[PDB]
Amino acid sequence: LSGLLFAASIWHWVYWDLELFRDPRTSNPALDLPKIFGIHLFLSGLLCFGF
Amino acid sequence: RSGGAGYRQYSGDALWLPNTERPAWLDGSLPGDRGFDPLGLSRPAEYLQIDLDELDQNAAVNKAGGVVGAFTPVADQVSTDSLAPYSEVFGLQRFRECELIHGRWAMLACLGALVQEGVTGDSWVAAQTLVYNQPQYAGIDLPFDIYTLAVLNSVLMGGVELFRNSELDPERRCYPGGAFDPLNLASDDSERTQKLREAEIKHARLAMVSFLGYTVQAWYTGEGALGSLNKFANGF
Amino acid sequence: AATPSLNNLIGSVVAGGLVLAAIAGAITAVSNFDSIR
Amino acid sequence: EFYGPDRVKFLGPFSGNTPSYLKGEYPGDYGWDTAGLSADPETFARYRELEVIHARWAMLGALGCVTPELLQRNGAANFGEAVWFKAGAQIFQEGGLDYLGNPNLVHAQSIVAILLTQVVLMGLIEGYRVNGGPAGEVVDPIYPGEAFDPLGLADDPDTLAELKVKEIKNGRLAMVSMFGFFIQAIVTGKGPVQNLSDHLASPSTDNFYSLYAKTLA
Amino acid sequence: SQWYGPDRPKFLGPYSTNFVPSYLTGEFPGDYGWDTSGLSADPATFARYREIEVIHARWAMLGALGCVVPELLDGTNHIAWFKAGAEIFGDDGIQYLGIPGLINAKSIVATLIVQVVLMSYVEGYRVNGGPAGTGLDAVYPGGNFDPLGLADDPDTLAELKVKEIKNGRLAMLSMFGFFIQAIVTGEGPIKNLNDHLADASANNFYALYAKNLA
Amino acid sequence: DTGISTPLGTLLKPLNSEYGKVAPGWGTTVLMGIFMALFAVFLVIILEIYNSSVLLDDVTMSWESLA
Ligand code: CHL
Ligand code: CLA
Ligand SMILES: CC1=C[C@H](O)CC(C)(C)[C@H]1/C=C/C(C)=C/C=C/C(C)=C/C=C/C=C(C)/C=C/C=C(C)/C=C/C1=C(C)C[C@H](O)CC1(C)C
Ligand SMILES: CC1=C[C@H](O)CC(C)(C)[C@H]1/C=C/C(C)=C/C=C/C(C)=C/C=C/C=C(C)/C=C/C=C(C)/C=C/C1=C(C)C[C@H](O)CC1(C)C
Ligand SMILES: CC1=C(/C=C/C(C)=C/C=C/C(C)=C/C=C/C=C(C)/C=C/C=C(C)/C=C/C2=C(C)CCCC2(C)C)C(C)(C)CCC1
């Protein structure tokens, strides 16, 4: 797993200019943290329940 | 046969409280519109846009973003976005789709729990573990290990739900018709279609509350649907 | 089945709420009476 | 017969003089205000509302104090305390209060919560009865109708007139009988249904005389 | 259309062309020209009689189905229709489909009380109109009573009405069979049918009860 | 100028498209405070159990609880 994460680190580093990361209203790099928190919290609760 | 002998005819739309008024956002066009939105969930949602915070270290002062302005987005606009088709979460048409989908499952579930308990004698809650330990239907052992069934259920339901999400018409997302209305009972705009849709949501809301009864009764009493019924009768 | 130790814990929670409410009530009363402009 | 100047009177033929303010136009008017308590028209209106509210409660109370006792001694159901003057004590038991003796009905355990819930619910209900609310707006403080007459038994005004009399008449009988329930309970610790059975068993020996009475001195 | 008019089929087959009552012309469904008695000569009685037939018909069709289902299902103990009412007096009471907890009815008086109150409202609404409908045909109200709009076409309604009466008359005749077969055989209609199916020459009315009927 | 486009990126784009969208005023802050107070009360209770400041009858709060 460490090797795969290392390879993904190189890719996500070289290809940093993804249209996913740009705010559609101003075309600037931004993150909708309130929504990202909800996404990454849902996974945490789902993974907590499964364990 | 004028009638008016065994009932008091009442003028006005039947609402959830004898003396109330419909919310401005509930006109009464949709089936089952009984004027019930006390929390105003379907009410048009107002929003304010905050400007992007300055986070450039090449600048002397990095102030926080202010209110670019207020905006009320138009709801009920389905888009090609697979992961979030609707423009707004809080929209009457989207909630209606959720109400029908939540409702149609509960109608199937309420009937299913009753039938399996009358056939196998096992509670609907207890049947979950029993089938997991031994896959079976109607007392017949199924020719499939639970592991394959688990992957199959996820894949089958995954494909089915992805097909359902392909529709872009908000009304057709709630009433697809076509292959799902082979008898052409409510594929028109007649009053029969309106009455049938009124019957569906009523049976749907009943099933949602009823299945909420099943799970709460199983938590408290411990028995299933038929079991709770028998326990109550004997409790006297 | 509630133990006397549990009753005091619940009472302390209630007492803590009354201390918080008595602080908030005093602050709101003075803030409303001695308002600015 | 029950309205107008020729209405029947509480003293029958011997009624003779009747209060001038106590004319017809109101249900249950038998020309009985010998105490002259409703001389003021404003007070008469208030007393009329008090009578019908005391009457409606009495009808509910009369039926409600007899049914659990009837069911218990008829074998229909087993209650914690069938007799009305003891049904309140059910909350002070091992199983709390179970409706119809079924542990899976209501199953109340805290008299406070019962008291708190009644205060909130009755307070709002009585407020709605005096200022309108979810059930309807106020037109007649004692005869709302509308949501309170869904069956439409009083749609015709002629039937509404005679029906109001039936309610006050049945109500008044309930008030007298419920007043009896209070006294019979104190004089006889037995429930009112038990008293009726005893009077039927031996009316000569089982009655307010040939028993108690002398004890009341 | 074959079921109406003067060319309609008649109860006496070929031997009915010269034997037709004047009042029976072919306007109403189920007209086979069978009015040998003087009944329904006056239109007022004929109109009244036509409704009673459809009512007795729709009732019989419900009765014919309901006198067989419980006897054909397990859990109900294959109870005979003429022996179903007594169950209310059993210790278990009336548990629908045999599933305990369903109705658990045990008071015959309570059942009759609700039936009288509900049926009186229902029958009253059917005669003087009511919430379901007002100003509609007495026997064919439709509307709330025709949700699937199966009879929207007048032509379809006419043929369907012929289907309703012919099925009803068969049910009425078979219900009369249930009454007599039970009073003679003492067994439920399904049991009587099964016995015939097994040994028809032995298990039939003539070879079993005809001799003791006098 | 629009950035690199990928099939996975266009799929996930709707989830990152409401950067500054807020509910006017205090929103559900009062509702949030209720859950915080409930969480604060819950944390106190479990703290008391471990600290033995609350002695529940069923819990033993020792290694004998393993048995
Ligand atoms: C068309 C309606 C109807 C019919 C035909 C019957 C028939 C019968 N019931 Mg019955 N019931 C009916 C309605 C009702 N029953 C009951 C409650 C009971 C109980 C509790 C019992 C019966 C029983 C019986 C049977 C008596 C024993 C026997 O073998 O008799 C055979 C006799 C016949 C076949 C001759 C009768 C045939 C005729 C066509 C009947 C016509 C009835 C009409 C309704 C006419 C009504 C006229 C007036 C009153 C309006 C019998 C077959 C008993 C039973 O099941 O025994 C085991 C029993 O214990 N019934 C209720 C209230 C819940 C009813 C409500 O509508
Ligand atoms: C004029 C027509 C007519 C009349 C007068 C009757 C009269 C009667 N029927 Mg009957 N029936 C009829 C038509 C008729 N039926 C028809 C056409 C059918 C075919 C569908 C049936 C099928 C039928 C059955 C299966 C049973 C009766 C029964 C009865 C008797 C008691 C009914 C009862 O319990 O209360 C009224 C009934 C109801 C109010 C129905 C309640 C709704 C049910 C219980 C819900 C559906 C089942 C439910 C999902 C079960 C949950 C668990 C399950 C999934 C395992 C009664 C004398 C019962 C009996 O024991 O006979 C003595 C009995 O079990 N009938
Ligand atoms: C006319 C005249 C004229 C001139 O003026 C003179 C004079 C004399 C003054 C007058 C008269 C008057 C009178 C007679 C009065 C009376 C009254 C009454 C008795 C009332 C009651 C009244 C009464 C009433 C209301 C009652 C009510 C009841 C109730 C609520 C009950 C409840 C209950 C129940 C159910 C059961 C349980 O377990 C218990 C309880 C819970 C408890
Ligand atoms: C046309 C003509 C002409 C010339 O002119 C003359 C003449 C010849 C006379 C005529 C004829 C006539 C006729 C034929 C008649 C018949 C009738 C009938 C049989 C009816 C039935 C009728 C019958 C009917 C309705 C039936 C009904 C039934 C029912 C509801 C049922 C019920 C039930 C059920 C389900 C089940 C259970 O367990 C039981 C009960 C509860 C019981
Ligand atoms: C001193 C000290 C400290 C610090 C510590 C640390 C921080 C350490 C580090 C650690 C680490 C951080 C380590 C690391 C490791 C890693 C590794 C060792 C890697 C591995 C990898 C490999 C082996 C390969 C893989 C691959 C690739 C790349 C690709 C694909 C294929 C494969 C998978 C093969 C502290 C704080 C404690 C304090 C005290 C003192």
Question: What is the Cα–Cα distance from E133 to E138, expressed in whole angstroms?
Answer: 10
Q: Give residue E175 CA to ligand 4 midpoint distance, Å.
A: 6
Ligand 1 near E94 CB (within 6 A): no
Question: What is the Cα–Cα distance from B79 to B73, expressed in whole angstroms?
Answer: 14
Cα E83 to chain center, whole Å?
19
A51 labeled binding residue: yes
> Token pair for residue E112?
């009759």
Phi, psi of B78 (to 5 degrees): -75, 135
DSSP B78: B
Helix, strand and coil percent figures for chain F, each rounded to 5: 55, 5, 40
CB atoms within 10 A of CB E133: 17
Helix (H) or strand (E) holding B141: strand B140-141
DSSP D151: T
Phi/psi zone of residue E150: left (φ > 0), alpha (ψ -120 to 50 degrees), beta?
alpha
> Token pair for residue B117?
């308990």
> Token pair for residue D165?
């009399």
The residue type of B202 is K
3-state secondary structure (DSSP) of residue A18:
strand
Torsion (CA) B121, B122, B123, B128 in degrees, nearest 10:
-150
Whether residue B3 contacts residue E128, with contact meaning beta carbons closer than 8 Å, is answered with yes
Q: Which has the closest alpha carbon to E145: E127, E126, E158?
A: E126
Whether residue E64 contacts residue E175, with contact meaning beta carbons closer than 8 Å, is answered with yes
Beta bridge partners of E105: E94
| Chain D CB contacts of B4 below 8 Å | 152, 155
Question: What is the Cα–Cα distance from E69 to E55, expressed in whole angstroms?
Answer: 22
Q: Which has the closest alpha carbon to B233: F56, B197, B221?
A: B221
Contact flag B8-D151 (C-beta cutoff 8 Å): yes
Question: What is the Cα–Cα distance from D160 to D148, expressed in whole angstroms?
Answer: 14
Residues with CB under 6 A from ligand 2: B 114-115, 118, 226; E 62-63, 65-66, 69-70, 73, 76, 79, 84-85, 87, 94, 96-97, 99, 102-103, 105
Q: Let me know how many helices (H) and strands (E) chain A has, helices first.
A: 2, 2
Touching, B vs E (3+ Cβ pairs under 8 A): yes
Q: Which positions 2-21 of A are in contact with F (Cβ < 8 Å)?
A: 15, 17-21
Helix (H) or strand (E) holding B67: strand B67-71
Residue from F2, F17, F22 whose CB has the most chain A CBs within 10 Å, to mutate: F17
| Of residues F45, F57, F58, nearest to C9 (C-beta) | F45
Closest-CA residue, ligand 3 atom 17, reads: D175
B235 touches chain E (CB under 8 A): no
Question: What is the Cα–Cα distance from E178 to E185, expressed in whole angstroms?
Answer: 10
B51 vs chain A: nearest CA distance in angstroms?
9
Whether residue B32 contacts residue B26, with contact meaning beta carbons closer than 8 Å, is answered with no
The residue type of F37 is A
CB atoms within 10 A of CB B130: 13
> Token pair for residue D12?
């029958």
E strand segments, F1-67: 21-22
Question: What is the Cα–Cα distance from E54 to A20, expressed in whole angstroms?
Answer: 71
Tokens 């409706």, residue?
Answer: D99
Four-residue CA torsion sign, B184, B190, B194, B199: negative
Closest-CA residue, ligand 2 atom 55, reads: B118
In total, the C-beta contacts within 8 angstroms joining chain C to chain F are 19
Question: What is the Cα–Cα distance from F22 to F20, expressed in whole angstroms?
Answer: 6
Question: What is the Cα–Cα distance from F51 to F48, expressed in whole angstroms?
Answer: 5
